[PDB]
Symmetry: C3
Subunit: 300 residues, 3 copies
C-alpha cells in the first residue's frame, strides 16, 4: 500500500552486475555492468572500466561469480561489451527509448559505488543531450541527480518500469564525491554500439560528409530565424552522402530523424554512433525555409 520502488527493483536488480578487473604494475579495478542478453551472457559496461584488464570477472547480486571475455569496445563513446563464460540462470534488462526521455522523469541508478556491493540510488533526469564536457570523444549524456560515485561506472540508469535509459559513466565532483551532477550514456546509443560489437567485434563509425560549427543566437538574429540551436553547415564534402542528398553550405541542420538537435556536438555523436550505410532524415533550414533530406551515411 505504501509507495515504493521495491516491486520493480526486485525483478530488475539481478540484471545489474559488479565488474571486477585485474591487469597491468599489478592492479585491481572495480565497476558495474548491465546484462543485456541473458542467453549469450552479454554485459554492457564502460571502456574505462575494462581498459587495462587481463582478467575480467562478473559478480551477481546472489553471489555467483563468472569469468568474462571482452567482445569489443569503443574508446570514443566509452562503451565496452563483455561475454560471460558459461552463463546460467541470468536476468536481462529491458531497454527503453531514451529519445522519449524528458527533464523531470524519475531515474534509479544501480551500480557498485566504492566496491560496497549493489547499491540503488534515486533521482530525476536533470538534463539531456549534454556535450562539451571533455569527458569523452562522443557525448550525448543524460544528466541525473541520483547519487553516482566511483564504482558506479558501467552500471544502469533505469526508469520507473525498471527499463534501461542509460549507462552511468561520469560525474562532476569538486572533491571526488557525488554532488548530484552525474552523466549516463543514453540507452539508444549504448544499444546501437552494443549491436555493432556483437556483429563485428568493433564499431563502424558513420559520417555525413559535413563540416560545420554550432548554430548560435547571433547567426539566428542575422538571418531572422526562430531556431538558435543546431548545426551550421560551412562545407559539404564532394562524393559524400550529404552532397548526393543535396545538403548545401549555409544550411542549418535543426533535426535528426524528426527529433530537434540541441547542438552540432549532439549531431556529431548521434551520427558517429550510427553504422555506415544507414539512412537518416535531416531537418534543414535553407534561406529560412524548412527541408527534409534523407542521407546515407559514409564510413569515417
Amino acid at each position: 500500500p505504501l509507495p515504493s520502488l521495491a516491486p520493480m527493483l526486485e525483478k530488475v536488480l539481478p540484471a545489474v552486475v559488479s565488474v571486477r578487473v585485474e591487469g597491468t604494475q599489478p592492479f585491481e579495478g572495480l565497476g558495474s555492468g548491465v546484462i543485456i542478453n541473458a542467453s549469450k551472457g552479454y554485459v554492457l559496461t564502460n571502456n574505462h572500466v575494462i581498459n587495462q584488464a587481463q582478467k575480467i570477472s562478473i559478480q551477481l547480486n546472489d553471489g555467483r561469480e563468472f569469468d568474462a571475455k571482452l567482445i569489443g569496445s569503443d574508446d570514443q563513446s566509452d562503451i565496452a561489451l563483455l561475454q560471460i563464460q558459461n552463463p546460467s540462470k541470468l536476468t536481462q534488462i529491458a531497454i527503453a527509448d531514451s529519445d522519449k526521455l524528458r527533464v523531470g522523469d524519475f531515474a534509479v541508478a544501480v551500480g557498485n559505488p566504492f566496491g560496497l556491493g549493489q547499491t540503488a540510488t534515486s533521482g530525476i533526469v536533470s538534463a539531456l543531450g549534454r556535450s562539451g564536457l571533455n569527458l569523452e570523444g562522443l557525448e550525448n549524456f543524460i544528466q541525473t541527480d541520483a547519487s553516482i560515485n566511483r564504482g558506479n561506472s558501467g552500471g544502469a540508469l533505469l526508469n520507473l518500469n525498471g527499463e534501461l535509459i542509460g549507462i552511468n559513466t561520469a560525474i562532476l565532483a569538486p572533491g571526488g564525491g557525488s554532488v548530484g551532477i552525474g552523466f549516463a550514456i543514453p540507452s539508444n546509443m549504448a544499444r546501437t554500439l552494443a549491436q555493432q560489437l556483437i556483429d563485428f567485434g568493433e564499431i563502424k563509425r558513420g559520417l555525413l560528409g559535413i563540416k560545420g560549427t554550432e548554430m548560435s543566437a547571433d547567426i539566428a538574429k542575422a538571418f531572422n530565424l526562430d531556431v538558435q540551436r543546431g548545426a551550421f553547415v560551412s562545407e559539404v564534402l564532394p562524393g559524400s552522402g550529404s552532397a548526393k542528398a543535396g545538403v548545401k553550405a549555409g544550411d542549418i541542420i535543426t533535426s535528426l530523424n524528426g527529433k530537434p538537435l540541441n547542438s552540432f556536438a549532439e549531431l556529431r555523436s548521434r551520427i558517429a554512433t550510427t553504422e555506415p550505410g544507414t539512412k537518416v532524415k535531416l531537418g534543414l533550414l535553407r534561406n529560412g525555409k524548412p527541408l527534409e533530406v534523407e542521407v546515407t551515411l559514409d564510413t569515417s
Copy 2:
C-alpha cells in the same frame, strides 16, 4: 501513465534563465535568474551574482541571448533585479506563498551549476526560517536537500505546480560541493524586495523601534511560560510605531501577522524586508498573558 515532473517542468523551465556576467583585471561569472515579469523583462537573481558586473547577459533554455541592465539590488538580503534589453516572447514564473510551506513539501531547484546549462534537481523542503548562518545580513532561508552547487545562485526553487517558492542563494558544503544542505531566499521576501526595486530603484527598510534578544527556554522556565522561541523585548524606542502601539520592555513577541516566529532573527529579517508605513500585527505575551498589537513601521 508513469509519474514524472516533466509535464510541469515543460511549461515552467523557459522562465528560469542563465545569467552571464563580465567585469573587473577582467572576470567572467555565471549564475541563474528567474523571469518574474515577461512584458518588462524583469529577472530576479542574487546580488553576489551581479556584484562587480560591467556587462550582464541572459540566456534562455531555447538558446536566445539578451543584454540586461541592473535595476536595483539589496546587499543585506542578497537580491538583485535585472531588466532584459528588448525582451521578446518571454515566459514568466508564477509566485507561491512561501509562508504556506511545510517541512517535507517537494521542491525542484532549477539553475546552471558549473555552467553546464539548465539543470533541474529534486528534493524536499528540509527546514524553514533558517537564520544565524552568517551568510547574509538578513536571513529567513528555506533549507532544501535538492542538489544546489556553484552556478545555481539566483535560480528557481519550485513547488510541484512549478510556482516559485524561493531564490537559491547559498549552501553548506565542507568541500565546495552539495551535501544536500541548500538555502533559498523565500519567494514572499524576494517578491516584496523585487517590488521595492521596480518602484524605487532601491529598498525601503522598515523598523518596529524595538531592541531585544532571542527568547530562550531559560527565560520561559524563569517566568513559567509555555513558549521558548521568539523575541524578548528589552527596550521600546520612544516615538516609534511600537511605542505608539503600546509595546513594553519585557514583552515576548511570539507572532508576526498570525504566523509564529521561530526566532528574533526571523522577526528582524521579516520586519526589515517590509516597507515603512506598513501595518503589522504582533503576537505578544506580557506577564504570561496573550495580546495582539498593530504597529505602523518606521524607516531605518
Copy 3:
C-alpha cells in the same frame, strides 16, 4: 492537494531531538536522538555521540530543553540509551519491522546536521545487511541515499508512515560531506539493544559457539551448491549450543529464523545482538542437503 511528506512529518518530527553534550580541556559536541518512550523519557542515540559526555542535554524542535542521564550503551553496535530528567508532553516514535524492508523503499532522515536545527532529508533504501565497513564491531546497516552529514548521527531514519526503520549512524564520504552513501543501525537491532539497556543497564551478548569464514562462489562451485552467501563453519566449539544441536564443521549456514543471510558478518551481528538463552533457527546445508537446526545461544 499537492503530494507531500509534511502531513506525516508534522505528527512525527517532535519525537526527533537534538543531543547536546559537554565533557573533557572542555568540549561541546552535537548529535541527534529519537524519543522511544514519551512517559519514561527514553531517547535512543549513538554511543559515539555520548562517549566522552559529562553533561547531556536534549532539545525539542519547539525549543524546550531537558537534562538527560545515560542509562546504558553498547560500544560494539554504537547504541546508547538516555533518560530525560523530568519529561513532560513528549512525543514518541512508532518502530517498524526493519526485516520487512526492501531496496527501493522510501526513507526520510531526521537529524541535526552541522548543528543547524532539526532537518529532514529524503531518499530510498539503497541496500540492506551491510557489513565489513570497519565502522563498528557489529554491523548490519541499512544503506540510504538520504543526505546524512556530521550531526545527523543518533537521529531517525523513517518510512512514509513516520515509523522508525533505523538510527542514522555513519557515512562514506571522500571529503567529509554526504555523497549519498549513508548507514543506519536497523530499528529491530536498535529496539532489542534498547530493551536490554532499559532491563539490565547493560547488553547481553549471545554466541552460537561457531568459528567460520564467509561462504563464497568458490566453495559453492567446488561442492556443486546453489547458494554462495552465508557462513562456512570450520569449527563447532564443544559444550556450546551449536555442539548440543548437532551443528558440524563443514556446514553452510544459509538462514537465520527463515531469513536468508547475505554474509557471515550479518550472522555474527544478528547473533551478538540476540540475548543469551534465546533459541534461533539455523538454515543449514550439509553434504548439499538442507537442514533446519534450533540452537540455544550461550553468553560471550
